[PDB]
Structures are given as C-alpha cells and as structure tokens.
Design a protein around this ligand. Structure first.
Ligand SMILES: CC(C)(C)c1ncc2c(n1)CCNC2
Length: 435
C-alpha cells in the first residue's frame, strides 16, 4: 500500500480491527520507511480512540482532544478531516504528505469529500500514496455486511413521533439501545416520550457530540438517541440498534436557497454503518437490528457534494490546476471544476464565514461571492418576506449591531441555520454581529 502512485481501500467489515490492529502496523511501517504521514480522524472522539491504539508511537496530535507532550521528533501527524481541509484553505503551508491515511473514509460532510478529492488527485498525479479505511466505500449496495457475532435483523415499523400504544417491543427491553433518528427535533420528541415512560436517555448530534458521548461511558443509560453522526466510529456497549432508515437531505433549489428535504431513505453505506454499531463482541451473539424502511441512493443531488466542489475550487494544488472529486463519488453533483473559484479577498471572506461565522459552505459562498465583507451583516435583514425565519410560529427578532430591533430575513435562505433551537440561537448571534 505504502509505495507511491497508489490508493488502497481497506474495506474490512465493521469491528474487524481497522483502527486498533491495522492502523498501528501501517504507522510502524511508515515511520520505518521515513514517509511523512497524515492520519485523518472524522471526529475528536475518534482522534482520542486512535491515540489509545497508537500509544507509544511517535505521533504528533494536531487536536485539543488529546493532551500529549509532543517531542518534536514526529514524522506522522494526526488531525480531523475538517482540520486538514481548513489548513489547505488557509494561508499556511501544509506538508505534501507522502502517505495519506483516512479513517472512516465514507464520511459525507463537505470537508471529508473535499479531503478525499484533494488526496486522490495527488495520488492520480503520482505524488503520494493513500489508504481510505471504511467498511462501506463509495458505491456500496450491501446494508448487511459481516460482523464479529451474529445479528438478528428485523424489518419492523419504527416510531418517528411520541406514541401511546402499538410499539411494546421498544420499551419491553432490558438492554441498551442505540436509536438513529432522522433529525434533532424528531430525537427530542422520542427522547421526551421514552423519558416520560421511565427511561434514561442520552441524545447525540454534531453540535453536542464530544460532551454528550462522554456520558455513555460515564453513566448507566437505557437509550442513546442519535442523528447520523454516530455512523462515524462512535462505539457503544449496546445489544440493540433501532434504525428509522431515514435522514434529512440538504437540497439547493434553483441555485437560490437550501431546504432540508425529507425525512428520506438513508444510503446502503449509512444503513450498514448504523447496523454496524452492534454485533461487535464475538462472545455476545444475538444483538438486534430493527429497521423501519428501505435504502435509496439519496447522496445524488445532496448539497454536500456541490459544497465539496466549492471547497476544492478554492484550494491551491499546482498553478491553475483544481482537484477533482474522488472518482467513485464524482457523479453525485453536476459541476464544472473551477466554477466556484474566488479571487484572493473574497476567498478570505469565504473561509472566515465558515471558520469563525460557523455558516454552511453554500451560505458562506453566496455571501463572499457577492463581495460582502465578513463583518457586514446587512444581508441578514434585507431578504424577501418569504425568507423570514420563524421562531415558535412568530418571526424571529434580533437587536442589530446598530441597536435597532429587526426581523431576521436573510437575503439567502439556508434551512440549516434554523433547523433546531441551537442552530437558530447561533445564527441570531451572527446576525447581531456577536462573532
Ligand atoms: C473550513 C471547513 C471547510 C473545514 C469548515 N469549517 C467550519 C464549517 C464548515 N466548514 C462548514 C459547516 N459550517 C462550519
């Protein structure tokens, strides 16, 4: 794998030991061969798990999730997928790594797709080697892969709302269950229904992931209610997965707005990853997987692939050359390479709206390409009345940086900025000039 000009896909089934057994061997061989190496973790939680598997080896942890004293002798760097892409975008030299290892290379967040595209392009140019580690590489059609111990698979109707009757099998269980819901708001409803029935419930989402995951190891629980983020290496000591088989999909309508379509079916890769949370202990057979719908190829036309092209168009590769998306996932978006290339000043605004503003890639691009500077928030208030953001069925209001009370009515509307109370609270602070 380690020889130049080659991309290898390590596709062992979930729980086969890619992180704790294969990754340390790869690191030893890379250090022995003097290969400048990068290890890319999907999340801060996986970076902490990787430090345990690589403990002792000279690895430089470029993350605050690990508290380790770096000796300065390391030729192997470990960072999150998003940190890699962020450093590529920023005015900072990123080493031209001889070996690029990506754990959970199935992650479909825009910054993961862009990291895959940049790395595979370097490999295609014969400049580097790469290893993409995932049980479900792009193109997988098998939602029931192998496991360490047998799994009971059962197609059943799964609640997506609070219930008074008809689902005895859910509460009549004395083990631990991980439940994948289509959204944060749907998770809040089921969590409230299970809590009222006497259950201890922990909720996980992208924004609360590091803090709340700790509680799964630190306290006794009956149910973990989570969005699709737990498909990225999150491990639990559970005997059952309940899977709605549904997700929300960001969709760009007419190139003018982003809506959250669905809930709609997950891909076969997502279903296999959600199922993959159980059946991991060979000494505990009989873990259950209850699924409530079929799979579909819902990544086609999904906004993350267009957003990944917006990231790659603004990453320097060599002169005017632009990195292409990783070949098995390049048809998920109809886009010309270079069409989102911004000039130096607007590109700096684009990065800052993402990094500091915490805005979605699509929304940051609309603001920056319009020649608006980072601190100029007038666009948050001058959109059409149909772009009015609503809070509890009444128009949301903020005090502007000028001391005037205005209705939140963005010029460009992206449903991700108000999809839940936490997201809307953060967008209100942005519109007020608080960050
Ligand atoms: C720089 C990069 C591409 C890694 C990034 N950072 C933060 C955010 C986003 N992207 C998009 C989602 N919103 C926050």
């Amino acid at each position: 794998m380690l020889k130049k000009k080659q991309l290898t896909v390590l596709d062992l089934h979930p729980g086969a030991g890619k992180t704790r057994r294969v990754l340390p061997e790869i690191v030893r061989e890379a250090i022995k061969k003097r290969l400048r190496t990068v290890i890319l973790a999907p999340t801060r939680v996986v970076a902490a798990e990787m430090e345990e598997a690589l403990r002792g080896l000279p690895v430089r942890y470029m993350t605050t999730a690990v508290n380790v004293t770096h000796s300065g002798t390391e030729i192997v760097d470990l960072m999150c997928h998003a940190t890699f892409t962020s450093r590529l975008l920023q005015p900072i030299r990123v080493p031209n790594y001889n070996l690029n290892i990506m754990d959970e290379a199935h992650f479909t967040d825009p910054s993961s797709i862009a990291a895959r595209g940049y790395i595979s392009t370097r490999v295609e140019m014969g400049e580097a080697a790469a290893i993409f580690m995932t049980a479900t590489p792009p193109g997988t059609r098998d939602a029931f892969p192998d496991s360490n111990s047998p799994i009971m698979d059962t197609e059943v109707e799964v609640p997506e709302r609070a219930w008074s009757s008809g689902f005895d099998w859910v509460t009549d269980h004395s083990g631990k269950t991980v439940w994948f819901v289509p959204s944060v708001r749907n998770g809040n409803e089921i969590a409230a229904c299970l809590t009222k029935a006497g259950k201890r419930v922990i909720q996980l989402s992208r924004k609360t992931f590091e803090t709340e995951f700790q509680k799964t190891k630190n306290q006794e629980w009956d149910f973990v209610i989570t969005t699709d983020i737990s498909e990225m290496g999150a491990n639990f000591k559970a005997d059952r997965v309940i899977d709605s088989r549904r997700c929300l999909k960001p969709v760009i309508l007419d190139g003018e707005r982003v809506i959250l379509a669905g809930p709609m079916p997950v891909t076969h890769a997502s279903a296999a990853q959600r199922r993959g949370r159980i059946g991991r202990n060979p000494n505990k057979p009989g873990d259950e997987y209850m699924y409530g719908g079929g799979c579909a190829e819902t990544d086609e036309g999904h906004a993350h692939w267009l957003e990944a092209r917006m990231l790659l168009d603004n990453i320097y590769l060599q002169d005017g050359l632009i990195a292409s998306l990783y070949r098995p996932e390049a048809d998920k978006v109809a886009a010309i390479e270079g069409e989102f290339k911004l000039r130096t000043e607007q590109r700096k605004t684009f990065v800052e709206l993402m990094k500091r503003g915490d805005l979605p890639v699509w929304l940051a691009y609309q603001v920056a390409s319009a020649g608006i500077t980072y601190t100029d928030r007038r666009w948050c208030f001058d959109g059409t009345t149909n772009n009015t953001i609503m809070e509890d069925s009444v128009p949301a209001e903020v005090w502007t940086k000028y001391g005037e009370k205005r209705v939140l009515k963005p010029r460009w509307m992206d449903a991700r900025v108000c999809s839940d109370h936490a997201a809307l609270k953060s967008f209100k602070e942005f519109a007020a000039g608080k960050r």
